[PDB]
Design an enzyme around this catalytic site. Structure first.
Site, PDB file in Angstrom:
ATOM      1  N   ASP A  37       0.817  -1.215   0.000  1.00 10.10           N
ATOM      2  CA  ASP A  37       0.000   0.000   0.000  1.00 10.10           C
ATOM      3  C   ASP A  37       0.855   1.271   0.000  1.00 10.10           C
ATOM      4  O   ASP A  37       1.487   1.623   1.005  1.00 10.10           O
ATOM      5  CB  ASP A  37      -0.978  -0.036   1.188  1.00 10.10           C
ATOM      6  CG  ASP A  37      -1.731   1.275   1.404  1.00 10.10           C
ATOM      7  OD1 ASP A  37      -1.945   2.051   0.444  1.00 10.10           O
ATOM      8  OD2 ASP A  37      -2.141   1.526   2.556  1.00 10.10           O
ATOM      9  N   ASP A 220      -2.581   5.332  -5.124  1.00  7.77           N
ATOM     10  CA  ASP A 220      -2.791   4.481  -3.948  1.00  7.77           C
ATOM     11  C   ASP A 220      -2.989   3.006  -4.315  1.00  7.77           C
ATOM     12  O   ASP A 220      -4.097   2.573  -4.642  1.00  7.77           O
ATOM     13  CB  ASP A 220      -3.991   5.019  -3.143  1.00  7.77           C
ATOM     14  CG  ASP A 220      -4.085   4.448  -1.736  1.00  7.77           C
ATOM     15  OD1 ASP A 220      -3.436   3.430  -1.427  1.00  7.77           O
ATOM     16  OD2 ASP A 220      -4.837   5.032  -0.922  1.00  7.77           O
TER      17      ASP A 220
END
Ligand SMILES: *[C@@H]1O[C@H](CO)[C@@H](O)[C@H](O)[C@H]1NC(C)=O
Length: 334
Positions: A37, A220
């Site tokens: 992430d 993201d």
């Protein structure tokens, strides 16, 4: 300092929303399914010390410090806050393997893991790929630790996210990119600032309806969807003829393929998605509803308000994250 190693992590594609790989923590290795992430900077996995009254700890792999001969105690409390939920626990240090690279890494042992949403996670934990500046407890992120070793060919990592059914769900190259998963040239956009994987966005087009003065785009890898601010998405969805539900927007499945293109204006180039790139086509019926892979998310200051370019975007565009030159590269995925 740079070496010559490149290293790949194989990813599993769960329902186009969760992309995870295997890491090993401890001696001997305890294995965990983790999301890599770019929107956060901490490593965490669920702890054996998590109360079984957290049902998510019953349904996930738990790190057991008492089974690791290379574990090093710290015990500082930490809370990690994400868009869709929060985890709490404490810090620990151990050996972590990721793509055959071994790093001594501080990480969170999570002892508090809410059933919503963590029951809905296929993965066990998170490997944050963001900068130290966004790291909770000022803990050195895993990539910074891999950089210190002077083994990677470049100060970069790259993401490929596939569609999906017994084939490659995704791939992270640490230290380079993989030309087998992209085509044409990379087109680079510099970060607003070092510390966050965020870039200037010059506009959003339906069919330029939105972001016409400029806005922010968080690239993201841990977000499933493309998200904008509430009012931005409300206006986007009005133009698509999509109706709001509690957690998502839906269109009637039949009108799905007739939905316009959505274009994101990043660093000179125009990044276009067709309806096929953002609609979950599960049916062609008029009497069924189909979910869009674009959501409303009000990301707070100082990161927000911002758009988030997640798995919906990355599926179409192979993404290189350049730490040496503080930029993001995009190329057409294959
Ligand atoms: C936890 O780590 C910090 C920073 O490295 C250190 O100052 C502290 O003494 C550690 N605490 C324990 C109890 O090991």
């Amino acid at each position: 300092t740079l070496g010559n190693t490149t290293s790949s992590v194989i990813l599993t594609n769960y329902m186009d929303t969760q992309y995870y790989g295997e890491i090993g923590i401890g001696t001997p290795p305890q294995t965990f399914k983790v999301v890599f992430d770019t929107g956060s900077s901490n490593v965490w996995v669920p702890s054996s010390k998590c109360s079984r009254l957290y049902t998510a700890c019953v349904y996930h792999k738990l790190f057991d410090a008492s089974d690791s001969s290379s574990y090093k105690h710290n015990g500082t409390e930490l809370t990690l806050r994400y868009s869709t939920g929060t985890v709490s626990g404490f810090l620990s240090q151990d050996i972590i393997t990721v793509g055959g690279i071994t790093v001594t890494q501080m990480f969170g042992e999570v002892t508090e893991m809410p059933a919503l949403p963590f029951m809905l996670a296929e993965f066990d934990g998170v490997v944050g790929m963001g900068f130290i500046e966004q790291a909770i407890g000022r803990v050195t992120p895993i990539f910074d630790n891999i950089i210190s070793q002077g083994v990677l060919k470049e100060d970069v990592f790259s993401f490929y996210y596939n569609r999906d059914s017994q084939s490659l769900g995704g791939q992270i190259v640490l230290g380079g990119s993989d030309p087998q998963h992209y085509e044409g040239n990379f087109h680079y956009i510099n970060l607003i600032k070092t510390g966050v994987w965020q870039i200037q966005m010059k506009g959003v087009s339906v069919g330029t309806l939105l972001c016409e003065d400029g806005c922010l785009a968080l690239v993201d890898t841990g977000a499933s969807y493309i998200s904008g601010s509430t009012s931005s998405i409300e206006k986007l969805m009005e133009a698509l003829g999509a109706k709001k539900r509690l957690f998502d927007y839906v269109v009637k499945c039949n009108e799905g393929p007739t939905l316009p293109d959505i274009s994101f204006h990043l660093g000179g180039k125009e990044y276009t998605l067709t309806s096929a790139d953002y609609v979950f086509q599960e049916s062609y019926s008029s009497k069924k509803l189909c979910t869009l892979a674009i959501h409303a998310m009000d990301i707070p200051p100082p990161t927000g308000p911002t758009w988030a370019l997640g798995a919906t975007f990355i599926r179409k565009f192979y993404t290189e994250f350049d730490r040496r030159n503080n930029r993001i590269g995009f190329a057409l995925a294959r």
